[PDB]
Design a protein around this ligand. Structure first.
Ligand SMILES: NC(=O)c1ccc[n+]([C@@H]2O[C@H](COP(=O)([O-])OP(=O)(O)OC[C@H]3O[C@@H](n4cnc5c(N)ncnc54)[C@H](O)[C@@H]3O)[C@@H](O)[C@H]2O)c1
Ligand SMILES: NC(=O)c1ccc[n+]([C@@H]2O[C@H](COP(=O)([O-])OP(=O)(O)OC[C@H]3O[C@@H](n4cnc5c(N)ncnc54)[C@H](O)[C@@H]3O)[C@@H](O)[C@H]2O)c1
Ligand SMILES: NC(=O)c1ccc[n+]([C@@H]2O[C@H](COP(=O)([O-])OP(=O)(O)OC[C@H]3O[C@@H](n4cnc5c(N)ncnc54)[C@H](O)[C@@H]3O)[C@@H](O)[C@H]2O)c1
Ligand SMILES: NC(=O)c1ccc[n+]([C@@H]2O[C@H](COP(=O)([O-])OP(=O)(O)OC[C@H]3O[C@@H](n4cnc5c(N)ncnc54)[C@H](O)[C@@H]3O)[C@@H](O)[C@H]2O)c1
Ligand SMILES: [Mg+2]
Ligand SMILES: [Mg+2]
Ligand SMILES: [Mg+2]
Ligand SMILES: [Mg+2]
Ligand SMILES: [Mg+2]
Ligand SMILES: [Mg+2]
Ligand SMILES: [Mg+2]
Ligand SMILES: [Mg+2]
Lengths: 248, 248, 248, 248
């Protein structure tokens, strides 16, 4: 067990990669604070953990709303006493729209969740971790934190922004035993790709050196490692889980 | 002259690097649309250009307000009939504040100007440039688009985000005649930086391979070059003007 | 155990980070082919592994000599029948010498070990891994694969080169079952670093966000993870273990 | 004129990008020291410059041979008194060969020219520039200094290595007024691409945001700028001339 006895929160844990991160955290021995904007989905992630013998609670949170983060931290402390680990996973792609046609609402929504929501979490999580001598934060960026994806300017800007705040937080709090890193997945087998035509899927696959898409477990395994004491000299860094996407 | 006959707008052109960019554009033969949130400083820049016999106008714009971009584009068209070049320079540092103490207002203000305001300008600028066959955009990022600077998480996130939206836009519009790049200055002798105490200056200098701070002309020269047809195979890229800051 | 039943070779395994990698591989269940240019140090590593009941052999290899790689591969096959994992760790710093004073012999020696020797190993390792369906390679680069360190131009060039050949190999062999990644440590407490004067240690520490140097286990843990099937979507990439060094 | 009165040497100036760099340097007012391994080609570059009214000399040099660099520097001083600018352009692609099948000779030849030859030049050029208070060096890397190109592991390793030694030299000599930068072209219209089928050319073109290949002048224009006093705060940096290749 990588994470025995540690307390870990996951944002956007109701579905997709976040669900798998929460399950992996629990399987590694962590006490998990499941959160999502969807209580139905988040509740089911909680029930999944509990039915597998893990220790967890659920707390609602819209990561775009600063006040929700306070409630996360309070839930963590109430259930488990401290916060050791946090994964800022909640995020959306946005619609595919060329920049010149991207509306203010499109821009604002994606930045608000994917960038501001990460900042508001990280801010609250630092404060909680300082109470008890540090901790580990993992932000879910993307390949789009290092390269551009056409049609999703807001997403690319946000995901680059996540990479940047990781760097600054690492220096501000490394003295105090907070580690923070980003993870950059390439295309992962989640709902969006599941619903494109095979031909499109094959074109995405050929953009990876492994010539296939990733699975959510492949992302979660790296998040778990980075959240663990094995990763004790790793901070301020971007860790790809990209199947070689960025290498060409 | 690098830019003879071209029409260029500059945001944040009332002082600092933007003023020098505007001056440089005019000295290279461009018609200049000077804009700033401070109409006094913007009018000053205009006066400096006109005093040398350059062709320019001033138009107010707060880059954080989408509607002001439409008035910028309209001012360019009214004055000079087209838009060929745009430099998204307006930006603020924020106050130095550790992430855990950074307020919502601090985060939102810096993102709104330094990231959203760049997006809103780029969006307007693309649309205008496409009317007449394309053009060149230069976004002013920072070293903080590549590394972190303690105390300015908002700034770092924003400046990374600027790097990212440069990449997408370049691919979306590269076959349509629009080039876009980002410039990353290190510490530059604007009024504020000029006036730091000597012991602070020396501390900053030692962070640069050249063991000195930069001058606004040193930034503006690169911006001018990137805005010119000499730079016809240059797009989607980040150009440091950093005195070696990033190289260690 | 991360690596149960796998056969792993380590270059430069007689001391320092390589010794710890070898130990870690064995503790994670791998059969280990320990190799080094120093047969005494290599035999010591072997003894440490065997003393705990691990399965291992020693084979001499100077990584700069192509033919020694063939004997490594042959030793793996003879002992354990296949090769699943390889870590190209052997490396030297060179002496600190400004570029203008660096001799041909200094340049050639460091490139020969740290760059050519990595290539010669990777080449042999690919061929062997392909016999049995693929495998995982980890190259030890450095922070000096991403930034420069004054006085060690040869080292910096070599370590950048290691980063680059990781990328090509990942694409060439990613559909054939071979993953390859590079690891970038900052300053680590090997024997030499352990023994620097306190005022030098403190100067180095301040270059890391964690305000301390790393331990060999902190490197080895990442190498083990990257060598395992948990890392199945990770290829072509650079993984810092740098305590935040690169983030400023 | 960007370079009036400065003395500039170019390696590999007999053909391709290097020829165009030498011509551009001369057109910008520099005194040019043309060098190549091919005296026939280099002599013709000299005659081209002279027939256009420029000032230049030719000196043979195989960049792989350290002693040849001494002869370059001596030629520069003999003709023109000092060395202000140097462009380390000479380079080869190598054959396209998967890593596992790349021979020692292939590896050694490409590293010897593209990496060691750059080091030997830079070493000699620093020494000469220090005599007269500094100067500017431009190394020609590639997109393959930042990403991998299948089939050319040696080339990718070398071109990454060039990026690295740029960083270290910038810090070692920035105090002393030596600037050094790398340039990274994507696919440029030179002999190789001229001889592939259209279909292949179109596939390469689609890898660039501009959806076309670069021209040698587009590279030379950036080299000229970086070699000039306009670029006085630019050091230690990688400058793409990639048509957006790296942005995806
Ligand atoms: N799927 C991919 O290929 C991929 C690749 C790279 C990065 N990512 C990133 O991975 C993370 C997880 O996304 P996913 O792909 O698993 O998506 P998903 O759509 O399957 O799941 C997203 C989860 O986040 C929740 N959510 C959405 N908005 C929220 C908000 N405002 N507050 C709280 N929860 C919210 C959803 O309800 C859902 O449970 C995101 O940051 C995404 O950008 C995904
Ligand atoms: N000075 C440095 O060391 C440095 C280093 C790296 C990057 N930069 C960047 O350079 C750019 C210019 O900064 P500077 O240092 O010259 O600053 P400055 O403070 O000297 O000038 C900024 C100008 O922008 C204007 N401005 C501020 N907010 C604006 C808004 N909302 N809309 C329009 N105009 C606005 C100001 O009124 C002023 O004229 C910024 O993007 C900054 O982040 C500066
Ligand atoms: N120690 C650090 O701070 C640090 C930081 C970043 C990267 N690295 C890298 O870590 C790797 C290991 O270095 P270390 O610090 O543990 O060094 P070390 O000097 O402690 O151990 C190096 C080992 O490699 C062996 N070796 C040397 N030349 C060899 C050759 N030609 N062939 C085979 N074996 C050879 C030595 O005999 C020794 O056992 C190197 O690639 C180094 O560049 C080290
Ligand atoms: N052509 C491209 O698409 C491209 C793209 C990226 C980078 N590059 C780089 O641009 C530089 C110039 O190459 P090019 O494409 O113009 O090639 P080219 O083959 O047209 O010209 C190369 C020149 O270098 C000379 N040369 C070769 N080996 C030499 C040696 N050992 N010493 C001295 N001179 C030598 C040749 O005789 C020739 O004049 C090289 O570093 C290359 O790697 C080229
Ligand atoms: Mg359901
Ligand atoms: Mg408390
Ligand atoms: Mg990193
Ligand atoms: Mg740095
Ligand atoms: Mg001919
Ligand atoms: Mg002299
Ligand atoms: Mg750079
Ligand atoms: Mg790419």
């Amino acid at each position: 067990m990588l994470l025995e006895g540690k307390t870990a929160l996951v944002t956007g844990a109701g579905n997709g990669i976040g669900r798998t991160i929460a399950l992996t955290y629990a399987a590694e021995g962590a006490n998990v604070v499941v959160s999502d904007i969807s209580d139905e989905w988040g509740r089911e992630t909680l029930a999944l953990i509990e039915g597998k013998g893990g220790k967890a609670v659920f707390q609602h949170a819209d990561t775009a709303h600063p006040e929700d983060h306070d409630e996360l931290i309070a839930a963590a402390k109430r259930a488990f006493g401290r916060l050791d680990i946090a994964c800022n996973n909640a995020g959306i792609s946005g619609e595919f729209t060329p920049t010149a046609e991207t509306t203010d609402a499109q821009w604002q929504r994606v930045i608000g969740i994917n960038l501001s929501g990460v900042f508001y979490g990280v801010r609250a999580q630092i404060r909680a971790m300082l109470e008890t001598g540090g901790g580990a934060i993992v932000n879910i960026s993307s390949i789009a934190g290092q390269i551009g994806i056409e049609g999703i300017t807001p997403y690319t800007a946000a995901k680059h922004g996540v990479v940047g705040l990781t760097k600054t937080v690492a220096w501000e709090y490394g003295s105090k035993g907070i580690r923070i890193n980003s993870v950059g997945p390439a295309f992962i087998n989640t709902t969006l790709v599941q619903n494109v035509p095979l031909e499109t899927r094959r074109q995405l696959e050929q953009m990876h050196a492994l010539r296939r898409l990733g699975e959510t477990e492949e992302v979660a395994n790296l998040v778990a490692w980075l959240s663990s004491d094995k990763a004790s000299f790793v901070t301020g860094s971007y860790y790809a889980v990209d199947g070689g996407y960025l290498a060409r």
